[PDB]
Design a protein around this nucleic acid. Structure first.
Ligand SMILES: [Mg+2]
Ligand SMILES: [Mg+2]
Length: 758
DNA sequence: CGATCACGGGG
DNA sequence: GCGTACGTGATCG
């Protein structure tokens, strides 16, 4: 009708699917139902006569037989060529996985197509429906929880001790222990606290629930405790419970009628941080410090009853900043959803490769272009092993006053001008074609390629938005249009990468190679022009470069670089654009996407080097941090080498505290299901043998002891370690922990692993 | 060696 | 749900 679409799903009623379109119309929540949309797949047949055998194929589901309800001969395009396929209709979406392989196996069937598109996404495309359109203002509520945790406990063993929420009315805490603070609501039990959260959510009726890692912590924990306590969480606008969907090796939680906006996957994509803790994220965006109160401090305060006001303040600030962050990051995700035509829930949890693919599937429908299939495992593997011809090793040592230049806005223009598309690649009876330099791939000029055509329209639309922005007096429209033009830039700058993405439907190795080859001519021009101006290029890859004027004043480097970007863009034709990304006080480069820098404010910025993860010992992580600090903060590689040498000697002489040697690894399945027994599994099996209920999710802490053979047979549970009896493996902690953590970094300064010991 | 298995965020 | 990440690095067998 007239509302803004925020989501879509389907329900089954009397065994038949019903699409639900969740809308917001002038502040009101509305649900539209559609019983008429039918599931389907396509089948390419060897001959039209075959349909009589194919329409008679059946399968089984829910104890009943599955049939093809209707067949329809249709004319479409495949790889820029007319094709005749049969549209096979099914009653229920779940009929598609049940019957698709029985159609594909048929000797008269050449191939099948569009057999793995989810019904709700199939519906939005086919009906031309775009989520997040209009000026409809949504409501937001941030939610967070605090729990009682002890090292290595099964997930959900300890109770939820606090629940916090925040919106514009303020940040509040619900707890079941007496804390005298103005924003704290004290209730009688964990059960009563969870029921109060349910009431707040039902009363505030937010369109968007903001969490920080709610997909993999807050909501699975709430569901675990609600199950324990035997209470329901009717948070859905249809009174349904939050729904845990297995998205990869992890989880994603949906709340029907709403948008569960988990900031963790969103921020992980948007900015570069070594660790995405809420406190690190908040500081990077708002330039303010946020205190972290660790799990052990929380457990100690809860159990002893001392210092609970500190824990309540931590819980409050967690909800307060989650709200603040949500408001900051939601507008761009809303514009991306709109652009790609899929709900924010799905779009906020996806890579740019999937954003491109959703955009392309919709455009293929609009253009009557049959979509190619996602590859099988063998093809996906063959794609990962493909070698690309045509980005040198970076300069060694420590450099000062570094400018970063970004090339990414160059590639959409190359795709368009050279008609780079899988449907135009090495076409027969082509009258005119473009030949890629060095690699020689031919792209037909006779018709615009599917992908160049779409990119051309995206770039044109962005230029119209930018023009409308200059001519606007309304700062509200200007702010909105700024988000819209940034969403196009992000989607357009993702096509180059998408061509080489192994899971892509419109994958094209030769397209990616050719864009690289044509792109290189401009990169080489940028490099020569930089060097003619006294700049030294320290590092260069397909995405950008780092450069300096050796021994020049920093303000002179910045000014010359800004003046250079303005100059080159005046020389580059069309929408080919170079961007000044930033300036760094110092930096060093190891290899492709492995480097470390420090800006003028003293913030260290790295790519592909830092090892902040629980399965690496503290001694290795601490030494690595010390090495980066000595190099970047002190400009002293000699100090860094001496730090490594001192740590290794201390390890050899058993001078390192055993607490800095603990390795943590999660159990992810029943112990009997393991095919390879790593040290944490060997430790786990002994724990289960002692009567410990070992379950997936439990994190095993261990220390590697001195001895013969694989580390599996010498690992000990941290709770069993006796410093007066057990001797840790110094050679393991040196060669497998500390030295790999620092050897890549120090390779940039001409050191090998063997020069980092006395 | 190829195969297998872990990481992130949260408490 | 017409589904189940990603890319990378250590250790087992
Ligand atoms: Mg959904
Ligand atoms: Mg919290």
């Amino acid at each position: 009708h007239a509302g803004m679409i925020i989501d879509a799903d389907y329900i089954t009623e009397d065994g038949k699917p019903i699409i639900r379109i969740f809308k917001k119309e002038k502040g009101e929540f509305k649900v539209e139902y559609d019983r008429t949309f039918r599931p389907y797949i396509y089948a390419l047949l060897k001959d039209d006569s075959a349909i009589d055998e194919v329409k008679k194929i059946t399968a089984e589901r829910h104890g009943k037989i599955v049939r093809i309800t209707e067949v329809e001969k249709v004319q479409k395009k495949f790889l820029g060529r007319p094709i005749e396929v049969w549209k096979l209709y099914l009653e229920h979406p779940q009929d598609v996985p049940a019957i698709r392989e029985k159609i594909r196996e048929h000797p008269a069937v050449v191939d099948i197509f569009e057999y793995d598109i989810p019904f709700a996404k199939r519906y939005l495309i086919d009906k031309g429906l775009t989520p997040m359109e209009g000026n409809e203002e949504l409501t937001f509520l941030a939610v967070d929880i605090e729990t009682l945790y002890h090292e290595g406990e099964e997930f959900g063993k300890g109770p939820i001790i606090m629940i916090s929420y925040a919106d514009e009315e303020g940040a509040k805490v619900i707890t079941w222990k007496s804390i005298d603070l103005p924003y704290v609501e004290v209730v009688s039990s964990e059960r009563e606290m969870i029921k109060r959260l349910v009431k707040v959510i039902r009363e505030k009726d937010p369109d968007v629930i903001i969490t920080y890692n709610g997909d993999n912590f807050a909501f699975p924990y709430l569901l675990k405790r609600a199950e324990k306590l035997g209470i329901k969480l009717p948070l859905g606008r249809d009174n349904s419970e939050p729904k845990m969907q297995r998205m990869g090796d992890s989880l994603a939680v949906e709340i029907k009628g709403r948008i569960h906006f988990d900031l963790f996957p969103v921020i992980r994509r948007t900015i570069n941080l070594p660790t995405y803790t809420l406190e690190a994220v908040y500081e990077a965006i708002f330039g303010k410090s946020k205190e972290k109160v660790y799990a052990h401090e929380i457990a100690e305060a809860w159990e002893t009853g001392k210092g609970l006001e500190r824990v309540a303040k931590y819980s409050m600030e967690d909800a307060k900043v989650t709200f603040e962050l949500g408001k900051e990051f939601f507008p761009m995700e809303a514009q991306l959803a709109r652009l790609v035509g899929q709900p924010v829930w799905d779009v906020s949890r996806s890579s740019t490769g999937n954003l491109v693919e959703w955009f392309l599937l919709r455009k293929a429908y609009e253009r009557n272009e049959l979509a190619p299939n996602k590859p099988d495992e063998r093809e996906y593997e063959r794609r990962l092993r493909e070698s690309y011809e045509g980005v040198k090793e970076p300069e060694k040592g420590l450099w000062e006053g570094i400018v970063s230049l970004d090339f990414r806005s160059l590639y959409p223009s190359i795709i368009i001008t050279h008609n780079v598309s899988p449907d135009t690649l090495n076409r027969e009876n082509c009258k005119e074609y473009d030949v890629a330099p060095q690699v020689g791939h031919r792209f037909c000029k006779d018709f615009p390629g599917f992908i160049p055509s779409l990119l051309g329209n995206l770039l044109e639309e962005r230029q119209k938005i930018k023009k409308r922005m200059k001519e606007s007096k309304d700062p509200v429209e200007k702010k909105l249009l700024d988000y819209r033009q940034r969403a196009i830039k992000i989607l357009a700058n993702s096509y180059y990468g998408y061509y080489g993405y192994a899971k892509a439907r419109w994958y094209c190795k030769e397209c990616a190679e050719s864009v690289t080859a044509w792109g290189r001519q401009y990169i080489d021009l940028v490099r020569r022009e930089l060097e003619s101006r006294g700049f030294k290029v320290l590092y260069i890859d397909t995405d950008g470069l780092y450069a300096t004027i050796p021994g020049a004043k920093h303000e002179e480097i910045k000014e010359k670089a800004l003046k250079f970007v303005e100059y080159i863009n005046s020389k580059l034709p069309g929408l080919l654009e170079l961007e000044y990304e930033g300036f760094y006080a110092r930096g060093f480069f190891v290899t492709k996407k492995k480097y470390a820098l420090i800006d003028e404010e003293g913030k260290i910025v790295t790519r592909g080097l830092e090892i902040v993860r629980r399965d690496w010992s503290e001694i290795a992580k601490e030494t690595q941090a010390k090495v980066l600090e000595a190099i970047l903060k002190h400009g002293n590689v000699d100090e860094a080498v001496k730090i490594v040498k001192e740590v290794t000697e201390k390890l050899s002489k058993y001078e390192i505290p055993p607490e800095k040697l603990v390795i943590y690894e999660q159990i992810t399945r029943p112990l009997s299901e393991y095919k390879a027994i790593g040290p944490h599994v060997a430790v786990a099996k002994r724990l289960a043998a002692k009567g410990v209920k070992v379950k997936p999710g439990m994190v095993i802490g261990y220390i590697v002891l001195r001895g013969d053979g694989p580390i599996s047979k010498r690992a000990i549970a941290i709770e069993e370690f006796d410093p007066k009896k057990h001797k840790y493996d110094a050679e393991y902690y040196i060669e497998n922990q500390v030295l790999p953590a620092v050897e890549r970094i120090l390779r940039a300064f001409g050191y090998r692993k063997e020069d980092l010991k006395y």
